[PDB]
Amino acid sequence: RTTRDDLINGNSASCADVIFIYARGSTETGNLGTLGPSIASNLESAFGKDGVWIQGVGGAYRAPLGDNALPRGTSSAAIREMLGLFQQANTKCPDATLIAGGYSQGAALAAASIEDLDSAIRDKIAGTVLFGYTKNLQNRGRIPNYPADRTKVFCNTGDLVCTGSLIVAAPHLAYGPDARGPAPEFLIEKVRAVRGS
Secondary structure (H helix, E strand, O other), X not given: OOOOEHHHHOOHHHOOOEEEEEEOOOOOOOOOOOOHHHHHHHHHHHHOOOOXXXXXXXXXXXXXXXXXXXXXXXXXXXXXXXXXXXXXXXXXXXXXXXXXXXXXXXXXXXHHHHHHOOHHHHOOEEEEEEEOOOOOOOOOOOOOOOOHHHEEEEOOOOOHHHHOOOOOOHHHHXXXXXXXXXXXXXXXXXXXXXHOO
Protein backbone atom coordinates (compact mmCIF):
# COMPACT_ATOMS: atom_id res chain seq x y z
CA ARG A 1 0.00 0.00 0.00
CA THR A 2 1.79 3.39 0.66
CA THR A 3 5.05 2.07 2.07
CA ARG A 4 7.27 -0.33 0.15
CA ASP A 5 10.83 -1.05 1.15
CA ASP A 6 11.50 -4.05 -1.10
CA LEU A 7 15.10 -3.05 -1.91
CA ILE A 8 16.06 -2.38 1.73
CA ASN A 9 14.31 -5.53 2.90
CA GLY A 10 15.36 -7.66 -0.04
CA ASN A 11 17.71 -10.69 0.11
CA SER A 12 20.79 -10.10 -1.87
CA ALA A 13 20.93 -13.80 -2.77
CA SER A 14 17.60 -13.53 -4.53
CA CYS A 15 17.65 -10.18 -6.27
CA ALA A 16 14.62 -9.13 -8.37
CA ASP A 17 15.35 -8.52 -12.11
CA VAL A 18 13.76 -5.04 -11.98
CA ILE A 19 14.06 -2.43 -9.21
CA PHE A 20 11.72 0.57 -9.19
CA ILE A 21 12.66 3.60 -7.00
CA TYR A 22 9.90 6.19 -6.63
CA ALA A 23 9.63 9.58 -4.85
CA ARG A 24 6.23 10.86 -3.68
CA GLY A 25 4.82 14.41 -3.82
CA SER A 26 4.65 17.01 -1.06
CA THR A 27 2.79 16.08 2.14
CA GLU A 28 2.02 12.57 0.82
CA THR A 29 2.01 9.53 3.11
CA GLY A 30 4.26 6.46 3.45
CA ASN A 31 7.00 6.54 0.88
CA LEU A 32 4.78 5.98 -2.21
CA GLY A 33 1.97 8.54 -1.61
CA THR A 34 -1.08 8.65 -3.90
CA LEU A 35 0.37 7.52 -7.26
CA GLY A 36 3.13 5.03 -6.36
CA PRO A 37 0.82 2.07 -5.38
CA SER A 38 -0.98 2.14 -8.75
CA ILE A 39 2.25 1.99 -10.62
CA ALA A 40 3.53 -0.77 -8.32
CA SER A 41 0.58 -3.14 -8.80
CA ASN A 42 0.86 -2.96 -12.59
CA LEU A 43 4.61 -3.58 -12.54
CA GLU A 44 3.91 -6.60 -10.32
CA SER A 45 1.36 -7.85 -12.81
CA ALA A 46 3.96 -7.58 -15.58
CA PHE A 47 7.02 -9.00 -13.86
CA GLY A 48 5.56 -11.04 -11.02
CA LYS A 49 5.91 -10.24 -7.30
CA ASP A 50 9.33 -11.86 -7.07
CA GLY A 51 10.33 -10.21 -10.37
CA VAL A 52 10.29 -6.56 -9.31
CA TRP A 53 11.25 -4.72 -6.11
CA ILE A 54 9.27 -1.57 -5.32
CA GLN A 55 11.21 0.95 -3.21
CA GLY A 56 9.91 4.40 -2.19
CA VAL A 57 12.23 7.18 -1.03
CA GLY A 58 11.64 7.56 2.71
CA GLY A 59 14.26 8.24 5.40
CA ALA A 60 15.31 11.91 5.21
CA TYR A 61 12.79 12.67 2.42
CA ARG A 62 9.95 14.16 4.42
CA ALA A 63 8.44 15.83 1.33
CA PRO A 64 7.75 19.32 2.94
CA LEU A 65 5.85 21.64 0.67
CA GLY A 66 8.23 24.53 1.44
CA ASP A 67 11.24 22.72 -0.10
CA ASN A 68 9.77 23.16 -3.60
CA ALA A 69 11.18 26.68 -3.36
CA LEU A 70 14.78 25.50 -2.79
CA PRO A 71 17.28 25.83 -5.78
CA ARG A 72 16.88 22.22 -7.02
CA GLY A 73 13.18 22.06 -6.05
CA THR A 74 13.89 19.78 -3.06
CA SER A 75 16.49 19.60 -0.22
CA SER A 76 20.07 18.38 -0.36
CA ALA A 77 19.24 15.81 2.32
CA ALA A 78 16.45 14.37 0.16
CA ILE A 79 18.80 14.10 -2.84
CA ARG A 80 21.37 12.29 -0.70
CA GLU A 81 18.67 9.84 0.40
CA MET A 82 17.61 8.97 -3.14
CA LEU A 83 21.24 8.77 -4.36
CA GLY A 84 21.83 6.37 -1.49
CA LEU A 85 19.01 4.10 -2.69
CA PHE A 86 20.32 3.96 -6.31
CA GLN A 87 23.77 3.13 -4.87
CA GLN A 88 22.22 0.42 -2.64
CA ALA A 89 20.49 -1.10 -5.67
CA ASN A 90 23.66 -1.06 -7.67
CA THR A 91 25.55 -2.82 -4.84
CA LYS A 92 22.89 -5.32 -3.73
CA CYS A 93 21.77 -6.32 -7.24
CA PRO A 94 24.33 -5.43 -9.91
CA ASP A 95 22.38 -7.21 -12.71
CA ALA A 96 18.99 -5.71 -12.10
CA THR A 97 17.52 -3.19 -14.51
CA LEU A 98 16.43 -0.01 -12.70
CA ILE A 99 13.42 2.22 -13.40
CA ALA A 100 12.44 5.39 -11.53
CA GLY A 101 9.64 7.86 -11.07
CA GLY A 102 8.50 10.84 -9.04
CA TYR A 103 5.52 13.11 -8.62
CA SER A 104 5.65 16.86 -8.04
CA GLN A 105 8.50 17.52 -5.51
CA GLY A 106 9.39 13.83 -5.98
CA ALA A 107 9.79 14.51 -9.75
CA ALA A 108 12.26 17.31 -9.02
CA LEU A 109 13.99 14.97 -6.56
CA ALA A 110 14.20 12.18 -9.14
CA ALA A 111 15.63 14.63 -11.72
CA ALA A 112 18.21 16.10 -9.29
CA SER A 113 19.26 12.64 -8.13
CA ILE A 114 19.67 11.19 -11.59
CA GLU A 115 21.62 14.28 -12.69
CA ASP A 116 24.11 13.77 -9.83
CA LEU A 117 24.33 10.01 -10.11
CA ASP A 118 27.48 8.16 -11.12
CA SER A 119 27.01 7.63 -14.83
CA ALA A 120 27.52 3.86 -14.60
CA ILE A 121 24.49 3.61 -12.31
CA ARG A 122 22.48 6.26 -14.20
CA ASP A 123 23.05 4.13 -17.30
CA LYS A 124 21.20 1.26 -15.66
CA ILE A 125 17.94 3.25 -15.35
CA ALA A 126 16.09 2.06 -18.39
CA GLY A 127 13.10 4.51 -18.05
CA THR A 128 11.94 7.28 -15.75
CA VAL A 129 8.42 8.75 -15.40
CA LEU A 130 7.78 12.21 -14.00
CA PHE A 131 4.26 13.48 -13.08
CA GLY A 132 3.60 17.22 -12.45
CA TYR A 133 7.30 17.91 -13.07
CA THR A 134 8.06 21.16 -11.14
CA LYS A 135 11.23 21.82 -13.20
CA ASN A 136 9.56 21.02 -16.54
CA LEU A 137 9.96 24.52 -18.01
CA GLN A 138 13.39 25.22 -16.47
CA ASN A 139 14.79 21.92 -17.69
CA ARG A 140 12.90 22.00 -21.02
CA GLY A 141 11.11 18.71 -20.27
CA ARG A 142 14.41 16.83 -19.75
CA ILE A 143 16.36 15.30 -16.91
CA PRO A 144 19.99 16.68 -17.10
CA ASN A 145 22.52 14.09 -18.34
CA TYR A 146 19.75 11.53 -19.09
CA PRO A 147 18.39 10.58 -22.59
CA ALA A 148 15.08 11.94 -23.80
CA ASP A 149 14.00 8.53 -25.17
CA ARG A 150 14.16 7.04 -21.64
CA THR A 151 12.19 9.90 -20.14
CA LYS A 152 8.40 10.33 -20.06
CA VAL A 153 6.87 13.51 -18.59
CA PHE A 154 3.15 13.75 -17.71
CA CYS A 155 2.28 17.43 -17.40
CA ASN A 156 -1.42 18.27 -17.54
CA THR A 157 -2.70 21.38 -19.29
CA GLY A 158 -3.37 23.96 -16.55
CA ASP A 159 -0.90 22.34 -14.14
CA LEU A 160 0.95 25.51 -13.33
CA VAL A 161 4.04 23.80 -11.93
CA CYS A 162 4.83 22.54 -15.48
CA THR A 163 4.93 26.08 -16.70
CA GLY A 164 7.40 27.55 -14.22
CA SER A 165 5.09 28.37 -11.28
CA LEU A 166 4.80 26.86 -7.81
CA ILE A 167 1.01 27.29 -7.58
CA VAL A 168 -0.98 24.07 -6.95
CA ALA A 169 -4.09 24.07 -9.15
CA ALA A 170 -6.63 21.24 -9.66
CA PRO A 171 -4.81 19.67 -12.76
CA HIS A 172 -1.79 18.99 -10.47
CA LEU A 173 -3.92 16.52 -8.58
CA ALA A 174 -5.22 14.76 -11.63
CA TYR A 175 -2.55 12.21 -12.53
CA GLY A 176 -4.45 9.11 -11.31
CA PRO A 177 -5.34 7.78 -14.86
CA ASP A 178 -1.72 8.24 -16.00
CA ALA A 179 -0.32 6.28 -13.06
CA ARG A 180 -2.88 3.51 -13.80
CA GLY A 181 -2.14 3.13 -17.53
CA PRO A 182 0.44 5.03 -19.62
CA ALA A 183 3.17 5.44 -16.94
CA PRO A 184 3.49 1.65 -16.08
CA GLU A 185 3.01 0.96 -19.81
CA PHE A 186 6.04 3.13 -20.61
CA LEU A 187 8.15 1.61 -17.85
CA ILE A 188 7.34 -2.00 -18.84
CA GLU A 189 8.09 -1.20 -22.46
CA LYS A 190 11.49 0.34 -21.61
CA VAL A 191 12.47 -2.61 -19.39
CA ARG A 192 11.47 -5.15 -22.08
CA ALA A 193 13.35 -3.10 -24.72
CA VAL A 194 16.60 -3.93 -22.91
CA ARG A 195 15.85 -7.20 -21.16
CA GLY A 196 13.76 -8.81 -23.93
CA SER A 197 11.54 -11.49 -22.34
